[PDB]
Amino acid sequence: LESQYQVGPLLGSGGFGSVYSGIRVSDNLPVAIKHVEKDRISDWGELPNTRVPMEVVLLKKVSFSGVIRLLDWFERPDSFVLILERPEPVQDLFDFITERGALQEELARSFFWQVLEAVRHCHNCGVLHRDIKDENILIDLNRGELKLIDFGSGALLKDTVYTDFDGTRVYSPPEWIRYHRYHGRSAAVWSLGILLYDMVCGDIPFEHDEEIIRGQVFFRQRVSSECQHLIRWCLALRPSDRPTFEEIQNHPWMQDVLLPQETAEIHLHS
C-alpha cells in the first residue's frame, strides 16, 4: 500500500536493495522505504506465525534508538517492502568520515561507545549483525545518536561456530579468511576493531587478505597510546585473546564518554 506512504527521493541502492525517502501520510512521520527482490535474497527465516527474509526476523527481534526500528513490511509478487524509521537530518558514518577525515578521539569515543551499546543490544536480543561498518551506521545529527542499519547479512546469535559469511571482507576476521569458520562475538569484536581504526585514522587498516592474516596494524594518523592499545586488542589474531564488550567499555580509553546531545553540540554544529 503506497496510499499509506508517500514516496520521495531514492536515497541509495546496492547489495541491500533500494532505499527511498518517504513519509507516512497518516501522521507525516519521516520513514525509509526499503525494497528487496525475492530472487536476490540469501537467507530466509520465518515468522512464528510464514516465510520472510531473515532481515525481517532479526529486525523484529531487536525492534531503543541505537538500532533502527522496523515499522511495517509488505509482501509483493517478487519483492518485499520494509518501512523503517528515518531520522532527519541524517548522514551515514561513511560520508561523515569521507568529508571530515580522521575524527577527534573525543568524537570517536562517543561514536564508538554508542555502537558498542548498540550491538550489545543486538546480542541481548539474539541477533548477530555480521556487517558492522561505517556504511551501516547512521548519525542523527540533531540528537547526536548513532543508529545501526542493514540486517540483511546477520543471523541468530549462537554460541557454536559459523561457516557462512555474506558481509564485508575487509571487516571479516582472519579466522574466516583462512578457515571459513568463526564465532559471532569474537568476529564482531574484530570488525569493531576495524571500525575504531577507521574512525581515528580516516580509513580502514587492511585491504588485502594477506594483511588480515598477518594482523599487523600501522597507524597513519596521530593516535593516542590508549586508543592504539584498544584497537590492537580488538584485532588480536586469536579470537580468545580479543576483549569482551565489558573489557572494551572498561578500557582506559573508553572512560568519560560524552552524552549523545553533548556530542552534537560540540562536534555536529547542533
Ligand SMILES: Cn1c(-c2ccc(N3CCNCC3)cc2)cc2c(C#N)ccnc21
Ligand atoms: C540503508 N539505508 C540508508 C542508506 C544507505 C546507503 C547510503 N549510502 C550508500 C553509500 N554512499 C552514501 C549513501 C545512505 C543511506 C539510509 C537508511 C535509512 C535512513 N535514513 C533508513 C533505513 N535504511 C537506510
